[PDB]
Amino acid sequence: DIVMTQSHKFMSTSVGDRVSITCKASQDVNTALAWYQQIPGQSPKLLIYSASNRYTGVPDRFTASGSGTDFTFTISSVQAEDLALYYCQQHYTTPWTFGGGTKLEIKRADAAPTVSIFPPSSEQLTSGGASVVCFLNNFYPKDINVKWAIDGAERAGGVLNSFTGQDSKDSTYSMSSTLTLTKDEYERHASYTCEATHKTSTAPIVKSFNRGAA
Amino acid sequence: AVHLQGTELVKPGASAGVKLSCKASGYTFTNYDMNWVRQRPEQGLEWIGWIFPGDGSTRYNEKFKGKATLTTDKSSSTAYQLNRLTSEDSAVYFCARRGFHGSYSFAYWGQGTLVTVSGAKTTAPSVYPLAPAAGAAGAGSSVTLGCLVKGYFPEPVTLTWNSGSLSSGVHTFPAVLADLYTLSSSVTVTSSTWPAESITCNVAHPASSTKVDKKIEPRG
Known part of the structure; x- marks a missing residue:
């Protein structure tokens, strides 16, 4: 199996600027390579066929080059609607393999996340459930590390994370982290901490609370 | 106006399989082979296999051995995706066809079919x-x-x-x-x-x- 590698899951760019996504085939697939673009909830769109040919209807801003083992997709001047996923795919020898994709994102001013932590509601506790929710909103860059601490020790079991793609309006990211325990275990601990590590502060952002303590 | 209409999403149980559909239109169905691609959130896009309605039958991807035994049917210009075992197969499946005669690149794609496997x-x-x-x-x-x-x-x-x-x-x-x-x-x-x-x-x-x-x- 040939392996298409797109070393950059994400690439920061700006509207009106030039950007180049790279692809590296594990083997010489000659010129049998295609580039696709994909927007959320839609199917891929062919942009480049046979290494460096624009498909019909594909605007002059899109270009591709390479032939052999290294290929590169380029956008002369990025437009708002170009901030999507771009996939690499070799069709030299079966099985056809796709690269892992590269998502172009808008670069903006660094923004610290606003962190909020929430204890389990009384209604959930009555059902025998205990979820501690932590919101980390409107931050940039997307690079962030969320850790949960229970009575001091880090907890990795029972954590479910969810996040939104870059906002189309303020170019930030947001995330939700939920620690879900049973009421039994929740009541056997006292200290619950949500800890956010982001480049915007030397010290990680920390939010906590003590069971039964205001 | 080439067009590939896929089937609505389905929720099979962690056990059986589901036959997906793709209704080609706007071109002589038998002149091009149909392809199927899988897309999971963590594994990206993975090609599954192709089918010749003119009948050259198939050729699957190593990885989708028997869990994906494609099939088609002329006189309706529709292609089908079997999906066998199903359990970790939760994802979106696409119907794909190429454009020009000499480039396996997929110029035409269906809207995709979401498949969720759950016993709930x-x-x-x-x-x-x-x-x-x-x-x-x-x-x-x-x-x-x-x-x-x-x-x-x-x-x-x-x-x-x-x-x-x-x-x-x-x-x-x-x-x-x-x-x-x-x-x-x-x-x-x-x-x-x-x-x-x-x-x-x-x-x-x-x-x-x-x-x-x-x-x-x-x-x-």
């Missing part, structure tokens, strides 16, 4: 109000409230704040599996406006015909 049955969500500890209203000029929705199936649920009148400063996150889809939403307003001016999350779950409007109140 339709289940209404529990909705839990998230308010800052000890009521109050934070310690700054802004306060964040929340709504936790969990234990439901299948997707989706719609969530709004104050019947939609509260839309700014809202963050509603993608639901994550776990037996009963669970998702949450946060809303951030001016500290002095809560609990002065009530805030309620409205959660609706079509599948169960259920709705829950949970008001967020100070708590101890």
